[PDB]
Amino acid sequence: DNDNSSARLFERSRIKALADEREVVQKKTFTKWVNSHLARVSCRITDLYKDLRDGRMLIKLLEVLSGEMLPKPTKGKMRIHCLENVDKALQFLKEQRVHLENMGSHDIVDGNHRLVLGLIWTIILRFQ
Amino acid sequence: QFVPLYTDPQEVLDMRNKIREQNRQDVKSAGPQSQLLASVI
Amino acid sequence: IAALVVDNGSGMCKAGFAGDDAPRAVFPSIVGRPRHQGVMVGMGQKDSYVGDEAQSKRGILTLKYPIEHGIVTNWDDMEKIWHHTFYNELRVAPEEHPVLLTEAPLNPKANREKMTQIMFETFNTPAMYVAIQAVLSLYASGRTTGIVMDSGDGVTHTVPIYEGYALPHAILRLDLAGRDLTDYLMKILTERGYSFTTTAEREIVRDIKEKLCYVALDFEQEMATAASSSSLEKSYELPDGQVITIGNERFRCPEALFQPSFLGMESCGIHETTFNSIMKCDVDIRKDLYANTVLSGGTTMYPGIADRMQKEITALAPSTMKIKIIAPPERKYSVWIGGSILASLSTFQQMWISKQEYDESGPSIVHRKCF
Amino acid sequence: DDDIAALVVDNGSGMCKAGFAGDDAPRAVFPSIVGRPRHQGVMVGMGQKDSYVGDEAQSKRGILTLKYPIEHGIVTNWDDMEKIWHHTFYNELRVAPEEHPVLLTEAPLNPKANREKMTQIMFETFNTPAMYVAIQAVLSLYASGRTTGIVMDSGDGVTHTVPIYEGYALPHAILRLDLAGRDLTDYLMKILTERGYSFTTTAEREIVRDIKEKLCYVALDFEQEMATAASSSSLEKSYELPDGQVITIGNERFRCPEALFQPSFLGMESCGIHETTFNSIMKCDVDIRKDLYANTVLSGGTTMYPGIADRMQKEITALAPSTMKIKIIAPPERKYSVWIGGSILASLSTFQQMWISKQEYDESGPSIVHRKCF
Ligand SMILES: Nc1ncnc2c1ncn2[C@@H]1O[C@H](COP(=O)(O)OP(=O)(O)O)[C@@H](O)[C@H]1O
Ligand SMILES: Nc1ncnc2c1ncn2[C@@H]1O[C@H](COP(=O)(O)OP(=O)(O)O)[C@@H](O)[C@H]1O
């Protein structure tokens, strides 16, 4: 088990760190990029994972970037209404030839870090 | 024909020693960033 | 800019940047699709689940493997793994970086040509290269001469390397995978009274095999001790909360590696395959080959495999010969590490397949550019 | 030795069959159920009967709850199995168990404790001089009379495919599927709800089984038959309940057995029986496959649906390469075939060497069964 212990230590040290500084850098960079465009409608985000759960912030970001006007989000605070808002945002992204896989409403709502970061990166890279 | 004619195995050994030294030190360093994201900062 | 190293064996995918010690992303190579009808209006719409996100919701998916025995059976799925690797995990632009890919020794040429065509046409990579895994294992090990046996989920292969040269004579490719061991483990767990049929239950059986297995030094005393007493018994908790006891089978599933007669195959064991690959080489180089045996791959992570391999090779080898078995504690990722080293050499930058060279030569450039 | 004939007992999940060696047909065939009363008992002087087993458990099923001792080929309750064996030996055949040896059949892939407990029960209580345990699908090939072939046995508990070439069986190509007529009866009971008929008790399950055995068939083309059933009413048939009520099964007749070929109707992820047979064929070596293509043998009571052979042949032909010739061998006596094979195995002069003696059991405990048999 000593060999397995050394291997497990390698897993929980090296790969953890080599990911972890990368997403904590990219989170700040993406937050700055989104907040710069979102200043025109006078809306700020202070944490990337919490603010994208409602789906209205992503709708406003696509509102600023796209140039035309998206459908209304549902005026409700339930989980299913958040799923509606995120699904509407993903539908609008799908209509503009943007390729997304392993992307769903429940993934954004539940707060998966790497999938939210991948969605933001795809919007940055392909839409602008 | 695959390997270049003039090369050093000691170069490969020194290179893997340089990588393993950084593994031992465990210095934190982020990955490369795109130039498009370099523009926004 | 630093290149990308993408190790793609069957079952798991590893990805990272060049010049780094460890890969950034490690995730299984599974693509699942929902089989049950959805009745709740307003949920998320997902046609396919890729990678680790697929393995969380195993209860409503039919798991499938795009790579079988080192061969990509489904290319549309392989595109999904590659795209999820590039955009969701690494979140890097594919056209900004060159990429490095790994494969088994003996494969059809159509696999190499299709990887080159997909890697150039779809992702618009500026450069790419295809490297053999087992040679990269020796770069990770740190010796210019030795024989390496890479056994992973999908494939097992032995190659000897002398002075950085890969001898095509003694390359042996055995189709004794860890997935075959998982299927044998299911078949022998049927005897105790436990039945696993679905692919999610196959993943549970794989977790059982990884957590609770070992290789005995001698099989007969282990069987006699298992029959005599109940000291060699362990318990495992299923995801539904049911406790199962394995007992005898813990040293029976990996023993199929050394004796393939349990699985019904005709090929010899891994020790005999390594010995035969050693015998195929020249007489005067057998010294370094016997003294520098290297183990690699996730299949060789069972406890006690190194001592058993040393004993089995020593029995076959001449008595005057020194036998040494090298097993690094981090050998499972060693292949990727070798690739990173090969990606960071100054003289390797001359070896990249440029985009315009591919435009001139077609997909057949890969055969003349890389080994 | 000459006049003494070993008893042959076929023991499936649904029904139990028993007879003497050297006979073409079993003497006693009866369902394997054990029923117990549930209501009040108010008439004094009628006598006390704690348990009902066998055919006369079926006759008084109105006031009984019915339990199956064998589920999916596994003996869950052993006391009821002892009841069934005692009723077989004494009431049905009227033979002393000490006089003759006993031959038993079982599924290929079963837990070890089932075999050990079978050996322990047949030596310790019934006191038999010898006993042997064999596989049902192997005995089906004995009944067929050919050296080579692939046997697909489908009973009430389990379906299994074994290939045999030149008297040699391949253990790695043996396939087991937990999809039998038991689940088909449950599926028919589920799909009869949408026409307004409700069967819930264990007594009504026998009525549903009778409806399945009388008014079911396998369509050669599923979609065309569904279109025909939607277009016209010529496919409808009428059945009479024991209380005189009349029901019309209609569309369901070809939908209940269709779950054999498409298990997704039951929520199962497994493949169909045709795909299971094809996969069992391709798990063997290259050379024998042609012979395994030419001698596919059907067996068991589940394969008694009309039109099963044509659909199976069509599906296998679609899966197999076109240059091979595919035929399906289904004798009219395929419900009893296993038992016939047992008798053929029990009367051989060579097989007298292979009996498990009582002295060997006394020396080796119940673990002797794995070393012998198969
Ligand atoms: N800790 C462990 N102990 C024993 N076996 C393991 C362990 N981890 C993984 N394996 C086996 O190794 C296989 C993974 O091999 P891997 O090195 O990922 O192959 P590749 O990288 O070529 O895809 C798994 O299928 C599993 O059966
Ligand atoms: N004539 C028939 N037509 C269609 N199906 C039948 C017929 N007779 C029996 N069956 C099915 O077969 C089952 C009985 O199978 P059986 O031969 O008793 O299996 P085993 O003997 O292996 O237990 C019944 O439950 C029923 O579903």
Swiss-Prot record, chain D:
Q: Tell me where in this chain the PTM N6-methyllysine is found.
A: K83
| Catalytic activity reported | ATP + H2O = ADP + phosphate + H(+)
Q: Which locations, inside or outside the cell, does it occupy?
A: Cytoplasm, Cytoskeleton; Nucleus
Broad EC category: hydrolase
Q: Under the cellular component aspect of Gene Ontology, which terms does the record hold?
A: actin cytoskeleton; actin filament; adherens junction; apical junction complex; axon; brush border; calyx of Held; cortical cytoskeleton
SUPFAM superfamilies, per the entry: Actin-like ATPase domain (SSF53067)
Q: Which GO terms describe its molecular function?
A: ATP binding; ATP hydrolysis activity; identical protein binding; kinesin binding; nitric-oxide synthase binding; nitric-oxide synthase regulator activity; protein kinase binding; structural constituent of postsynaptic actin cytoskeleton
GO BP terms, alphabetized: adherens junction assembly; apical protein localization; axonogenesis; cell motility; cellular response to cytochalasin B; establishment or maintenance of cell polarity; morphogenesis of a polarized epithelium; positive regulation of double-strand break repair via homologous recombination
Pfam families for the chain: Actin
Q: How is it modified after translation?
A: ISGylated.
**Which positions carry Methionine (R)-sulfoxide?**
M43, M46
Q: What is its EC number?
A: 3.6.4.-
Specify whether GTP-binding is a keyword of the entry.
no
- Point out residues bearing the modification N-acetylaspartate: D1
Q: Which UniProt keywords apply?
A: Acetylation, ATP-binding, Cytoplasm, Cytoskeleton, Hydrolase, Methylation, Nucleotide-binding, Nucleus, Oxidation, Ubl conjugation
**InterPro entries membership:** Actin (IPR004000), Actin/actin-like_CS (IPR020902), Actin_CS (IPR004001), ATPase_NBD (IPR043129)
Report the family membership: Belongs to the actin family.
Print the miscellaneous field: In vertebrates 3 main groups of actin isoforms, alpha, beta and gamma have been identified. The alpha actins are found in muscle tissues and are a major constituent of the contractile apparatus. The beta and gamma actins coexist in most cell types as components of the cytoskeleton and as mediators of internal cell motility.
What functional role does this protein have? Answer: Actin is a highly conserved protein that polymerizes to produce filaments that form cross-linked networks in the cytoplasm of cells. Actin exists in both monomeric (G-actin) and polymeric (F-actin) forms, both forms playing key functions, such as cell motility and contraction. In addition to their role in the cytoplasmic cytoskeleton, G- and F-actin also localize in the nucleus, and regulate gene transcription and motility and repair of damaged DNA.
> Which named protein is this?
Actin, cytoplasmic 1
UniProt organism field: Sus scrofa
